[PDB]
Structures are given as C-alpha cells and as structure tokens.
Design a protein around this ligand. Sequence first.
Ligand SMILES: CNS(=O)(=O)Nc1nccc(Cc2c(C)c3ccc(Oc4ncccn4)cc3oc2=O)c1F
Ligand SMILES: Nc1ncnc2c1ncn2[C@@H]1O[C@H](COP(=O)(O)OP(=O)(O)NP(=O)(O)O)[C@@H](O)[C@H]1O
Ligand SMILES: Nc1ncnc2c1ncn2[C@@H]1O[C@H](COP(=O)(O)OP(=O)(O)NP(=O)(O)O)[C@@H](O)[C@H]1O
Ligand SMILES: [Mg+2]
Ligand SMILES: [Mg+2]
Lengths: 310, 273
Amino acid sequence: LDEQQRKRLEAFLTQKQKVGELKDDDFEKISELGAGNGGVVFKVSHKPSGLVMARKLIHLEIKPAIRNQIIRELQVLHECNSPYIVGFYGAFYSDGEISICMEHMDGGSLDQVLKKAGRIPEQILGKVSIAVIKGLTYLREKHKIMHRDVKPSNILVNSRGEIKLCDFGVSGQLIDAMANAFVGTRSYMSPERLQGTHYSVQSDIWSMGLSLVEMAVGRYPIPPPDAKELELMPMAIFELLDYIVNEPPPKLPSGVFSLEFQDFVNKCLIKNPAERADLKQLMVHAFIKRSDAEEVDFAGWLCSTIGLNQ
Amino acid sequence: DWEIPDGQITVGQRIGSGSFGTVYKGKWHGDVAVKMLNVTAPTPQQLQAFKNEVGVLRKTRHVNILLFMGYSTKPQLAIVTQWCEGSSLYHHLHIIETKFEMIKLIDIARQTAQGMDYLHAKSIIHRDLKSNNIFLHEDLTVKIGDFGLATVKSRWSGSHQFEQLSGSILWMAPEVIRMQDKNPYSFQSDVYAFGIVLYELMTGQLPYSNINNRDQIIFMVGRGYLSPDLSKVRSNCPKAMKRLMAECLKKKRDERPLFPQILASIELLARSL
Ligand SMILES: CNS(=O)(=O)Nc1nccc(Cc2c(C)c3ccc(Oc4ncccn4)cc3oc2=O)c1F
Ligand SMILES: Nc1ncnc2c1ncn2[C@@H]1O[C@H](COP(=O)(O)OP(=O)(O)NP(=O)(O)O)[C@@H](O)[C@H]1O
Ligand SMILES: Nc1ncnc2c1ncn2[C@@H]1O[C@H](COP(=O)(O)OP(=O)(O)NP(=O)(O)O)[C@@H](O)[C@H]1O
Ligand SMILES: [Mg+2]
Ligand SMILES: [Mg+2]
C-alpha cells in the first residue's frame, strides 16, 4: 500500500461521507454506460453532493422477503476498501429495481476497451494480471469471499491508471436470484464449477486466464482459432460448456507471446483445479515478476485507445 | 394483411423485457400488450416468414389462449396481443406467494394442458412454455401467451434461421439444451416445460433450488446428470399427479406423453378427489 494509493483510498472515504441516504429523487441521469443481461448502468450525478457515480439497475422478479435480504447483504460492500476493488457508495431498492451505486470508472470495462483495441499488448496484460491477482487476494483474505465471475466485463479501468474488480458474489441471495436468467452466449466458468461445487479461488484463476487469452488475441478462445485464422494475426452455448469440460484447454499462439506469458496462462488453464496454480504461486511467477518491474504507461495507453488526450 | 399502421397504437408505460422483446401497455380499441421485438431490422426473407407465422397465430381462438391481435412494422417491428389483468402464474407462485387450495392448483394445471392441447391440435409448438407466460385472468381462467413465433426468435443469417437457444433454462428440455438435432423443439419439448410448470405448482419452488450457477444447470441438464428433485413435492399432493409430472420430465423425449393423454390424466384425478 504505497503513498499514492493511500491518498486515493482516504480521498474516497471523504467523498463517501458527503453521501447520506440514497434516494431515487437525488439523482440526475447524465448518460448510459453499458447494458448487459445483468442490468443497465447509467452515469448519474448525486445532487445532494454533486458526486458523479455509476448506477447499476438490476430488475429482478423476486419476492420482497428475498429482495430486502439482497439489499441487506449488499451492505458488506461498505467494508470492501482496496485500490483493486471498485468503490461502493450504497445500494437501495426503488420502482421495482435494485440500484447499486458504485464509483465512476471513466475508462470502462476491459471488454469495451478490447473492442476499441482489437488486441491488448502483453505488457499491458501484465499489469492487468497483477491487479486481478491482488484483487482476488484482498477478497480472499480480508473478506473470505470468492469472485465467482471474473471476466473482461468485470475488470474496470480509469484514466488514473487504476485497474479494479467489480460485480463479485458478495450477496448469496443475489447469486441464487440471478440463477433464473436467460441463457448467455459465452461462459467463463471453470470446468469444476460446470460439474459441481467449485475449488475456491482456484476457479476464479481459470476465468482470469481465459479472460487473458481472449484479450491477448481479441477473440473468445472457445473454440480455439480455426484454420489460418491464427496466422491472420457460431458454437452453441451447451457445446461451449461441453468443450470446456471434455476438451483440452485453450492456449496462446507459440510465436507471438513470450514464454513467460504462455506458461502463465497455461498454469491458469489446467483443467484439474488442484494442479492449477493458486494466488501464492501466480504472485511469484516469472511473467508477474517481470511485468511488475516494467514501467509501462497504462493510463496513457488507455486514453490513446479510446481516443482521448492523456 | 394483418398489419397495423402507425398512429393507431398508443404506446404507454414500459412493463419489462423477456427472452425476445420488451412489452409496453398500449391502447388499440382497448388495452393491448405491445411487445417491441428484438429483431429491429428484419430481412425481407425473415419478414415474409414472420407474416406467414402471424397468419397461423391469427386463426387461433381458444379460451385458454391469449388473443393474438396481429403485428406492426411502422416505428419498429412489434407484436400486439391482448392485455390481461392480474399477475402471471410466476408472480403468484414465486413473488406474491398466493395460497391456493389443492383443487385450485389442479384446476390451473387442467386449463393449461387444455390450452396446450389446442395449440398442438393446430400443430403449433409453444417453444417457451413457463409460468411467466401463463396469466390468471381475473383469478379464474388460465391464459397462455408468447406461443409460437419461432421466426422472431433466433436471429437470421440471410436465409438460414437456425433455431438458436434463447429463453429460460429451467423449462428447457435436455434435447433442447443441447441443440444438437436442429429441430429439438417438438411437442415433447413443450410437454417437458409443462412438467416443470407442474413442479412449480406442486412444490411452490423453482427447480434446482440448491444450484445457483446458470452454466452448471445448462451443462448438467443437457448431459442428463441433473434432474428436478421430485422430493420437494408437498405432502398434500395426489399420488396420481406426482406420477404424471415424472412422465413429462423424462430425459429422452420419446418417452414423454402427449397432451391428449396428459389432459385426460388431470381430469381423471380432478374428479376422484
Ligand atoms: C457467473 N457467476 S455465478 O456465481 O454463477 N453468478 C454470480 N456471480 C457473481 C456475482 C453474482 C451476484 C452479484 C452481482 C451481479 C453484483 C453486481 C454488482 C455489485 O456491486 C458491486 N459494487 C462494487 C464492487 C463490486 N460489486 C454486487 C454484486 O453482488 C453479487 O452478489 C452472481 F449471481
Ligand atoms: N462503473 C462503470 N463504469 C464504466 N462502465 C461500466 C461500469 N459498470 C458497467 N459498465 C459497462 O456497462 C456494460 C454492462 O454492464 P453489465 O450490466 O454488468 O453487463 P455485463 O457485465 O457487461 N455482461 P452481463 O454480466 O452478462 O450482464 C459493460 O460492458 C461495462 O463496460
Ligand atoms: N399480454 C400481456 N399482458 C400483460 N402483461 C404482459 C403480457 N405479456 C407479458 N407481460 C408482462 O410483461 C413483462 C415481460 O414479459 P415478457 O417480455 O413476455 O418476458 P417473459 O414472459 O418473462 N419471458 P418470455 O415471454 O419468454 O419473453 C412481465 O412482467 C409480464 O408479466
Ligand atoms: Mg458485469
Ligand atoms: Mg410472457
């Protein structure tokens, strides 16, 4: 915890104190940010305090007993205070929708940045891997919770060079309420979880590796690249799940990326969760020791990719 | 030409979105339901197949079937059906927690199979049967909606509507989950979905209540490893009803009975009670 991070952490608690009870009338809608199948997110201004925050709106059709429990369980996010976890202002329910208010990350998710970038450099993914590993560690030690949903759309970045996790399973009732959702298109779900209860933070590490491969090549790696598609450098949802379980895991191309990076993602994609590397081993991996020593300008690379000045 | 022009449909409050559209409460010689479809720019090959399916959905008038009033293409492609008061069956069982008698529960299962039997008699596969698409009109008659419409579900290439998998996974049959048949949707796939609806009525819960992973359900149900826990059927439910539920939930589709047999079963235990 360096000085520039302790400065920013303490600065967030100060603006957070300026926010009291969160009412729906206290917000003015500025612009829409994104819309997955979880909910829709807006950039809003909190009029009683002028703070600009991101407001996620989840519309669940659950009974009020389960819903009031979700709001109660989400208040643990007031305790999550790390430079690798997205800030949390307060959650509430109104007009048939749960509103989770979190800090605004003007860079967006890495899933959006990947679209504007095509591919992401290995030197940048080195810093992203450090933040995800540090983010999963803080959730594992200081709160004993998993993330359960590591994917590019849950890794958030901003213009100040920060990389943070969000949308992690903190509310057990919210996790079970989301289980009655429509089918998605792609899955980042570790093969053990697809088949029965997870192997703790190991199962989050698989998703990080699968997210790294997708951002490194600019394409969802299931199934792996076809013919000459790799030298150029519509599967069903059930077949993707059957592939992850009963097929060899994906891998980086052998010629484009360093061996330290190729071995890093290969230790993260071992189909056996026990043979898979844990946070202790990945923290001292060769690719991480190197990428941590490199002085890469992440904030400048981000604003260049989006089209803004640095 | 069952098409409705512009300025005729007063679009009002936004209600919500589902597997293939967003519903608004509209006005059109009375309250209607306007579902703005997710296929905004249809292909002229997709458009003619949609008009063809509306023609079949048009000639369907049954008491347990929501009235299909046609479509519109002026602002965007949409669907106009009858607006029904009260809550859906999903709201009653899982949100409001309405406490029906066992007689009323069996009666809901009878009218649902009755309407489904009419749809199959006219050779229409629902493809999306669930308690969300079952409304209790004035807390008496059952009304099934969101039936058919296989062409506005699963986006087109240019001329190859490959049946694509969308909807709620809790009601999808295993052969539907796999999509490895390219015509997995069948009469028995609707029968299976009807079996899950029976599980809702007889247990008061949704299936797989102890599984909170979406993709785990998709994989294990498609692999035959996972099945609804029939132990959760409440004590006061008829034995003849619990056996009928298990016949609709058979993993292989050819073992599932058809609705002429299902409706006959329900009315038999409806009398002897
Ligand atoms: C795909 N994984 S799963 O386990 O099957 N399903 C789920 N996985 C993870 C999680 C959930 C549920 C869930 C969501 C979606 C969530 C979203 C925003 C949020 O607010 C927030 N604010 C600041 C920082 C970080 N979050 C808190 C949240 O807590 C939750 O429990 C699954 F439902
Ligand atoms: N705090 C934020 N700041 C900037 N952009 C955000 C923020 N939160 C979410 N977004 C964007 O909003 C979009 C939708 O978010 P979301 O509602 O969680 O769906 P998703 O996570 O992308 N996919 P899914 O989880 O399946 O619904 C994402 O692509 C994000 O890039
Ligand atoms: N004909 C209707 N009359 C009144 N309310 C309706 C009607 N159809 C749908 N609704 C409501 O509109 C909302 C969304 O419905 P809908 O778009 O059909 O999603 P869904 O039924 O839950 N899933 P799906 O039908 O497979 O797309 C729900 O609250 C429904 O109860
Ligand atoms: Mg997300
Ligand atoms: Mg419906």
